[PDB]
């Protein structure tokens, strides 16, 4: 008994199978369960607000036709090249920045058909997907990225889409991201779409990504800290008159402004203020304040010298010098202390907000 005669028997010009007609026509909507296997997640760009994922898409539906009930085997794996002679549903992705099918050697496809009529359809697809990330807290944040599967041409009365009760979303073993940690939560919900044309089914899968803090420390938090320490050296060491303190102050201020511009390089231009902006602004304020402190002490020394040119005169020299030394020593102790206070509030507030986000999620 040849397989060929069976293959054209089911689907052919002698069979009444029209591939342009939905199963259960003039009937209850076609229920379709959708399964996702993630082969390779990654390539997340804040500039373009998108990420690229290579997935395996499995969708199962039951057709009343194509129930063979002849061969002694429950299921049979069929050729991928015959997938044009059946009723595949029309499933697109809403937030799509273009996608390409895989044609390495033969088509990366799969067809299976059971005795009752159940069809299993599996497709490999690279999907560039748009994620509108919110960078309110840039180095420490959780981003939720959306995958939506929708019916372009069929309203709710036909082709309803559902998720799979067990193992709807899977991930390949040992799949890692250099910048992000994928969270094994993957909350699944469905949001229907309303248009003037009609009401169309959609189902959504949500992925949670946290940011590694290892890179951001070394790149942008340690060097800014070092520049603040460099500004700190001027107070406890250099004499009141120096052609170097002004140099140290201008070099530290200029490097901080270049570093501040540096931080906003990969980042897209956005109106709101990020956490990294708050840190760089405070460090720039500290360095600027250090230069202004030296400026104030130099000016007090100028009054000492101006009065000096004009015993009774000796009484005021000591008070100006004591004032200059007093403000120098108090600056010396105060600026690392107030920097420490800023660090403990900044770090604990971002820690708590980090805990806070999961409740909304």
């Amino acid at each position: 008994m040849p397989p060929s005669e069976f293959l054209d028997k089911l689907m052919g010009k002698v069979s009444g199978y029209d591939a342009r007609i939905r199963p259960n026509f003039k009937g209850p909507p076609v229920n379709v369960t959708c399964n996702i296997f993630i082969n390779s997640f990654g390539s997340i760009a804040e500039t373009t607000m998108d990420y690229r994922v290579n997935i395996f898409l499995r969708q199962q539906w039951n057709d009343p036709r194509l129930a063979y009930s002849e061969y002694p085997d429950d299921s049979l794996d069929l050729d991928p090249s015959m997938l044009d002679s059946i009723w595949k549903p029309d499933l697109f992705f809403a937030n799509e920045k273009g996608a390409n099918f895989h044609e390495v050697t033969t088509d990366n496809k799969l067809l299976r058909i059971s005795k009752n009529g159940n069809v299993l359809y599996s497709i490999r697809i690279t999907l560039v997907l748009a994620c509108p990330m919110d960078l309110k807290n840039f180095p420490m944040d959780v981003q939720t990225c959306i995958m939506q599967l929708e019916s372009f041409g069929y309203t709710m009365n036909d082709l309803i889409f559902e998720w799979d009760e067990k193992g709807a979303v899977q991930v390949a073993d040992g799949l890692t991201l250099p910048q992000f940690i994928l969270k094994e939560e993957k909350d699944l919900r469905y949001c229907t779409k309303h248009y003037n044309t009609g009401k169309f089914t959609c189902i959504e899968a949500r992925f949670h990504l946290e940011r590694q803090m290892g890179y951001y420390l070394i790149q942008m938090y340690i060097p800014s800290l070092l520049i603040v320490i460099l500004s700190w050296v001027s107070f406890w060491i250099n004499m009141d008159a120096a052609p170097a303190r002004v140099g140290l102050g201008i070099t530290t201020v200029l490097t901080m402004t270049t570093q501040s511009s540096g931080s906003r390089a990969s980042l897209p231009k956005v109106s709101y203020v990020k956490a990294i902006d708050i840190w760089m602004a405070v460090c720039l304020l500290f360095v600027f304040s250090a230069l202004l402190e030296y400026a104030a002490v130099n000016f007090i020394a100028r009054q000492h010298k101006e009065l000096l040119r004009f015993k009774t005169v000796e009484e005021m020299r000591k008070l100006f010098i004591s004032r200059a030394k007093r403000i120098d020593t108090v600056s010396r102790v105060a600026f690392p202390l107030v920097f420490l206070i800023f660090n403990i509030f900044y770090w604990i507030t971002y820690k708590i907000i980090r805990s806070e986000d999961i409740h909304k999620q």
Copy 2:
């Protein structure tokens, strides 16, 4: 009663339906109403003078043929793969920098046909569209970007294009741009096209975009301001003779020129002068003037020393020193004041011009 026989009945080799002939041939022009749904606007580049939009294009026309008048249902949703056996009109976009159709799984298409013959055609298309933006006022401006729909092969005597009276242009809910704010005005007008070949229909949709000012402040207005403040420190603090004031002046001038080059980085090269150029030029003039002020006071001190080497001599020392201190103190008070006057005129004039633009729009 099989649907298949009906489907080939209407459009087939037994029917007299030629898909190469316009409806109402040798007759009144085919009226076509066009509806636009914007799925994802964005990716606006000043360098290439263009933006990329993913839209849904709906065009409705009435064909005297294809009026079925048989089934008890007013409208029927038909297969997308049979869209090659009918008369679609020829609609292209004039300002097009290339476009790609969507082929995720099955074709993203839609066909509906009513009892009278009304056809609804809906297509998903990513369109890179050319916008010739005018950057006379770069950080604060409104840009108008054009979408034009035109008939390539049919003159005005056939295939007239019209807009939809209600809801011609829609936008997906919660659609945002990081740099721009889309305005909910969307004025619709039609501009016919004249060629040596003929006169061809066109309709146009206009979008208004304003620029977020949050990024531009932090990136380019605050740092330039800080450099001007740094130039200001020299006057009220440093002594008349210093190997540091010249350093502070050269570092501030050099950083301002680098920042001025920095501002014109994303921007395309253009002949005219932008608002940001005016601001950077004035700040550079202020920093340069601060260095020149120190230069003038140093020169006056040189005359004091030159005369000093040559009582009657004591009379002129006081006048040179008083002249140096007087010009120093007056510089000290004057430069932030005149900077404040420049800021209030610059900001109010761009505020009023900002109000002014809407009248032309």
Copy 3:
């Protein structure tokens, strides 16, 4: 009388029309007049020596066959999808860096056919075209960019190509370039091509582009000028002994060399010397000469001090000091004056050469 029967009548399997045979076979060459409409010129890159233009290409030829002489209408607009059943000529562009046909919705094409047999063929095509620009004078120059239309497979005995006597090249109204001004001259000439395979027709269209000077002034001519002024301050202000004049000199020299590298950034690497290179070299020479002047005066002061350590001694102090002051004052007056002389010769010579180029053009 159905249009369909006429349409297959002219071009069909019952007609003797072979689309693989040229009209007037074994006869006089097929004359073809070519008309160009420029929809969007632009995107001119010196790096890749090319520009991208979106055009409308219209070519008209007469076929002795296809003369219908039946319908009461002189001309008829036919379907674009039937353009594969006729004799289109083979026209390629010689200086082509690849091109893409437009497939937004339906094919952007056009067919018309008159009573005598005249065929009008109109095609929309984006063409990346290679322009070998000569940058001898970089900021001020006129570039001539070439479009060539050639026959790949037919020698001169067949398919001769001609231009259109009136309106051969048109440009869309209100079409502008940010960097260039297109000139409304558009000289048309034909240059035949000789190969070992044969002699092939070609026709050429030439476009003249001048460079806007607005960007280049602000970006590269004003800042270099400012650096020269900064070098100038040292002479008229700073004392003979200073730990600042050396700073001002090294900062100005280093910034000029960075700016000189900056100018050659977009530019392709070329052996010959550009005008901008001449300007940056002269300004760098001026800044270097200013540092060398300070160096010479410092050395003369060193001889004054060396002789001072060793009245009769008093006689030579005055001559060394007078020599130092004299060379300082003469440097002070001379360097802006000789800079002015360089500017007037440089600007008038490029002005005259600018006038000169049109004669060759």
Copy 4:
């Protein structure tokens, strides 16, 4: 005896050869031996975690059908265009970032068929392949890059894939990489894949790449060393009071931080600390310590001057000056010595770890 009749005889509509049915249907799995020839390896990017290889893929399987047993010749080379009328297996690459078939002139393909039924299939394919490299030791490391060949649509009961016993992987003669050295080991192992759909065959080939150290020395190890030497000059030469030592210290610290940012430019952002980060951190610590040393000696000189303003006084001047000179001389000798100790431990530990890696490999 015409070849044509034989060609359609074997594979044709009169033969019972269905190309949609696997050989040995309802039988033992199809054994397939796979041979790889590497034409051009290269283009290894750490940013995208991938490499691009152009290969020749040869797979041999035996079909019980297609055994001609007629012609006197054992093997015959057949047309590449007839490769659509046979049973090619479905082989994809798991870690695939897209691939393109070669269509220069005619298809780059090959078919051979022996008397028994053995089929040889050879295909040229450029493969962008994902390599998840581990940069724990960035300049000196061995990276293992994976090629996996898998069956998309056939479970283990059919289409088993095996390697070739002799010469499974070959490399073109004189094939070199600028950055890497390919190792002639190429360990071959097979890892089966388990899915909810089924169990699918896979075979894997592993390539070992070491990094050339020539570039990294010149680019990043010699310049950082030079900056440390520059910091070293301050101790043995410059006087205790100087407006230059602070300059030399700030310039060296700022250049080291810029160089540290420079090193992490091509590199993807990663949480863990690389070897190059360890080296740059230690050199930055040395330069910072040199500036702090000068700071400490300047402060000791300040106590000497402060006590000096207030014989018995003469006794303490000598002790402060001797303390300043002693710490200066001991800094002078100590810092190159402790730098040498850091270099010998760093280099030997990376040497041993380099030897260590091969055991895991």
Copy 5:
């Protein structure tokens, strides 16, 4: 006598012409002469080790069939669209990084057929070709770039490829490269390919490219020279004690290291040392030596001052001062002289090696 009947007569279903069978089947190998016309060479990138060339490929072979011997004309130009009904050979390019066929308007192709059966086939093809350039001497070198034409599916017993005896490689008139000079030598040799599958024909064409030295002088040889001159000013001008000589030395060293990194920007990372690296290393050594010289003289002045604090004392002041002045003057004369000696050896050795290379070529 219609041409159409002749056209299907030769190649058709009534003729015995099978396009899947080689001419002279079971016979002597098909000799194929190959002619290359280079339309536009260029776009040579050291980073990707490749160049892009647009060529015309002409291959002539004799088929015993297709000898018409009917029409009074020796040769006839046939339609390009019928090139699928004949035996084109299978010619690919070995070192191929992908290629695209030209489809501007109609196919850029050509067919001619003579009375004897000679076929002329001409194709336009843009080829990105891999050139493994050796950068041992980077600014001055000759690079040899390889084009190989090979048979993918046919072993040596069939389809032998040969070059054309006269005019095998041509170049379009007035074709220039901005960076390179093409040499009119173009040595042609054939290298057969051996595989486990078989032995396959190949022929190779070699192009010689020299580098223009105009850009490299202005960009990287003149500025480094200027920095060395700047280092030279310190010796002959500045006093022994200065807060400026250290500045001039650190600025020159830092700019040289940035310029050294600058030179290796376009260049791919390679282990070996280039000529430009040798020049930048020697100039960096000179600048470093200048700073060390100032350091040594400052230290000798320190011994003079240290001994001064402790007549008999007057005797040693003169010897330390004379030692400092002597080493200063000898440094002054010596460093430009030894720089001149380095320049004459470096330039003559690269001159001779430049002559030397042609012998290997």
